[PDB]
Design a protein around this ligand. Sequence first.
Ligand code: NA
Ligand code: NA
Ligand code: NA
Lengths: 350, 350, 350
Amino acid sequence: DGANSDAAKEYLTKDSFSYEVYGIIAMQAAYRDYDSGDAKQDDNLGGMQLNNESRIGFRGKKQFANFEPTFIWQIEGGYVDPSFGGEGAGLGERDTFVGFESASWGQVRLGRVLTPMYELVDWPASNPGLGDVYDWGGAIGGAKYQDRQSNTIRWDSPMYADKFSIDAAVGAGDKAGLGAGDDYWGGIAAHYKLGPLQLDAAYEGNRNIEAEGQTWENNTYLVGVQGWFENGISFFAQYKYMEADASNGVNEKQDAMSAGLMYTTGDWQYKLGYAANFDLERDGKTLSNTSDDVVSAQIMYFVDPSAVLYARARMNDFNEGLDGLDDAARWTSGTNGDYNEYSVGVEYYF
Amino acid sequence: DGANSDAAKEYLTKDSFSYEVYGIIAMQAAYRDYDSGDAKQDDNLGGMQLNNESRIGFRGKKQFANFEPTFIWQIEGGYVDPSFGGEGAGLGERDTFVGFESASWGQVRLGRVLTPMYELVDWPASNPGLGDVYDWGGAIGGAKYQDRQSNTIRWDSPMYADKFSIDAAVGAGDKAGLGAGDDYWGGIAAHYKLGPLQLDAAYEGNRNIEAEGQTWENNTYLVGVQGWFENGISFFAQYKYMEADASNGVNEKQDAMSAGLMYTTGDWQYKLGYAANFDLERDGKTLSNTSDDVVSAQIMYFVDPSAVLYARARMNDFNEGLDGLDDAARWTSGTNGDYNEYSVGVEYYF
Amino acid sequence: DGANSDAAKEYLTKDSFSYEVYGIIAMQAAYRDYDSGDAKQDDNLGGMQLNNESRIGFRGKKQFANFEPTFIWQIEGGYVDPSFGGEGAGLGERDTFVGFESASWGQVRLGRVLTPMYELVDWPASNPGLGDVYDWGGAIGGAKYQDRQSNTIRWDSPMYADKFSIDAAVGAGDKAGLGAGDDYWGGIAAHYKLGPLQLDAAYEGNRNIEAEGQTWENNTYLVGVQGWFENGISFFAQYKYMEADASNGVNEKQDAMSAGLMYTTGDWQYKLGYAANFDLERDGKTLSNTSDDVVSAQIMYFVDPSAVLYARARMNDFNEGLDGLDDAARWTSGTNGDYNEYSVGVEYYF
Ligand code: NA
Ligand code: NA
Ligand code: NA
């Protein structure tokens, strides 16, 4: 089977010991307390679990004898036993790609990577515990943005004059990737370094998204800032604007923000985070109680140059529900209900 | 996505070459002959298959600069092509955890491990071929015990005065681990070395188990012995008592045993095993023909310090059926039918 | 869990550093244009995708102290993000086995490997892009041959007098491997080296295949040739004959061919390929428009001793449909429809 069978094994010189095995060992003990309005549902979903996000991966680089841009590749396993999920993960569930790189133009990767929008949404703006609201939370129809996506080409510019860099990508959609649709997307992000700050902007457009009996276009825009100061304070903040249009003429808008403050002293780092989705608007009218917010607090200990321990507390207050354009409840991160969470954790890189 | 995104990669020192890749290569060619009472079912289930239980794993230890108890981790793949099952296994399907260790108090592991009761059930008392009866075999409602389980904290004491040790654990249940229930369990085991013998005891309690229209509590108790003598004989034996109670008042009891005899001489080891589940009792009344037994023989050759070859024959006589508390047949290891099996195998550890 | 639990870990000497990690990194950017007769189906299936056939594997060899034939094993992961498929692959999805070897009698492998017939069908005769027609393409009932199959024992003879070798195997079928049937197969292939040519023959017989309300027997025969000349031309050609019989008396025949021509000069290789299935015959009558063909072209650049780049164009014209013996459409590689494809790719071996 395959584009070239096992011809590589049979005929090419094996480039032996030209790989690296790496891993992130990550374990979070997390207790949740739900207030869904059904006591049974609250017992099911709540309680204590262990969220094992450990993963193994493989990567390398090769300078080919007859091609100047260095070849690069990586294959990264999924999380091995996350909470709310069964055990076991395959290779290639996370960032998994091939590509090429040259000083003058940066790097191009083909495969499964983060979109430029998602990379900023995820880090810094989803940490700590903010993701349910700011990563996949939201009430808009269509697809606000992809996150980690297969069938993607992505270019990462170099750092021009030590200050400026661009991330750009296009790819197939979730259905297209299975031969079941013609969804696609593109997007771009930029970063400007500036004394102690960095400025971020990003865009993502998603086309031919099918959902709720309709085809959608999405556009999503974002701005934010980040700073680190010599006194040990650092922070971030962002604003995120989301628009969608359906094939039947319906328009939808919703916006959001996320911010964090952090103080690093000696081997410690304290951190507070807040993020919010505001009420959604459909065809000019606001839908009441379609907003979400989350507050979070964290302390982290630099236990080894290669590792950290952390404790964290957070409160999610989610929206009270909406219908999509087919008269059915639209799934949101709030569908399972309001919940709080206490957790401790460890992360180690080899 | 995740508790900390890719922050570990981006900010921590990579602790390079601080891992080990290991594996157990294991292949059993096994021929089964079924006598289910349906000739078609006998052809399907019987015949020759290759039971590939090979697996790969990853593990290590790290002495963190600011924490005295040594960090330990492991991630172990599932069996790659076992009989009765499709090809392929993910990482984390087997014992997969993080933890910490200190000479004075032993070791604590968090993640996916064997329960203390299951560890003694499995080894020595399931070998060879005794598992259909004594591992997952049985007729009791609820859950007699978990086996390999995610969402588990487990403490392994040291060997106190060279003689005594304890294994203790608690964790979430099979439903809880998916946010679909509030099942949990706890258990403990102890071991006492004593001239040529070791004595074992263990317990497991499972709570909020849903099955058959009811919530169950289970309690399981076990006692056994193991011995090795200078003449090359060794053996084991165990007695296992299982009780369950349902939310509607029904009580169930069933007990069981397993024993093995071995003679080790030069590069060989001969082995006979026997295990049995006795007739089940429900609300004081015995249910006839709800018992199971199995007899097994084996010869094994120490073909290398790192490997063994073996041949094995066994005969399983399973129970004739029972209904659970919803008037539906209750699945047991006997539901598929009586069968015999001849096998040969190899196992290698690197 | 398992034939011998964790006994190997606990009692055998760990044969440390006695393994190899290897991979093939393989990425094909492929654009398809379908002409199915439904424009919607054409958009879904067509478009651009990235077909990531990268995989990781593990292998090794061990000279056991008390057994002369060297022990061999391998475990090979599946493709990590192929087109038309979700992300992620487990270990053991590809050639995964244990075995033994001796210079005087060759090698025996037990596990999951290619059938002797399929190996010749796949390579040389499915490259480049010929597979939809000549690999899994066809209209015959039953199973023309297995491809990569678990539950297989396979013997690879040595090269007798530097000229002659045999590949032979038997194993369980797709249903048998899950305890759901008594299907099996056997097959054999031979190769005769002869100045610049090699002659191939092969056979496969499949028994107790259930499909379309009937039990089938299949027999498949193949002859071909291959040559490499010092001037830089090489080629291959094959003829493949497929017969089937059903339990209700129906007979089916179909034949096929595949050929390729190659010119290798300096760092380049040009390649043209053609393959065809001819009209199928059932109970002596030909069924019109049940044939398939494909033409393909390719250029490949030997970019490094360990790697290649390539570009490729191909045109598949498939059959127009048939019914199986139950009055329902029989699935073929033409069911989705005629399509063309342009692709570029890279392959690297470490
Ligand atoms: Na996605
Ligand atoms: Na379980
Ligand atoms: Na098959």
